[PDB]
Amino acid sequence: IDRLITGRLQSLQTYVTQQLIRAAEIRASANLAATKMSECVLGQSKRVDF
Amino acid sequence: STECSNLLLQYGSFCTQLKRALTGIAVEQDKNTQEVFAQVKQIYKTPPIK
């Protein structure tokens, strides 16, 4: 039971670590989308390729 | 070693997701280089007059 507990605990910790890294990436993309909503939609942008 | 492979089979799918993570990083590096440098559609050239 201790061997099974250690294995399943390691699997759950690995899943939480990948979820945290993907959450950081999704938060960066959401910050970019919020900036594009503020500048593209609510105004007119002079930035090239933005 | 065959015996080590046989007992490594009992640990599940850790190396599949390690390989998936490293493959994602490898694709991401080429994506980074392509988004930085390949921004122009055509290959312009300088005239021979300088």
Resolution (A): 3.0
CA distance A40 to A29: 16
Q: In the numeric block, which tokens belong to residue B18?
A: 């390690």
Helices (H) and strands (E) in chain A — how many of each?
A: 1, 0
- C-alpha atoms less than 13 angstroms from C-alpha of A44 in its C-beta half-sphere: 0
What number of C-beta contacts closer than 8 Å exist between A and B? Answer: 8
Q: How was this structure determined?
A: cryo-EM
Q: Find, in chain A, the residue whose alpha carbon is nearest to that of B14.
A: A11
User: Is B17 in contact with A14 (Cβ distance < 8 A)?
Assistant: yes
Burial track A16-35 (b if 16+ CB lie within 10 A, e otherwise): eeeeeeeeeeeeeeeeeeee
- Could you tell me if B17 and A14 are in contact, meaning their C-beta atoms sit under 8 angstroms apart? yes
Q: Which two tokens stand for residue B35?
A: 């988004």
List the structure tokens of B48: 């021979």
- Cα–Cα distance between B35 and A49 in angstroms, integer? 12
Lookup: tokens for B33 = 């280089």
| Token output for A2 | 């201790």
What residues of chain B lie within 8 A of the CB of A14, using their CB? Answer: 14, 17
**What would the two tokens of residue A13 be?**
């910790």
Q: Which residues of B touch A11 (CB under 8 A)?
A: 12
- Confirm if B34 and A30 have CB atoms less than 8 A apart: no
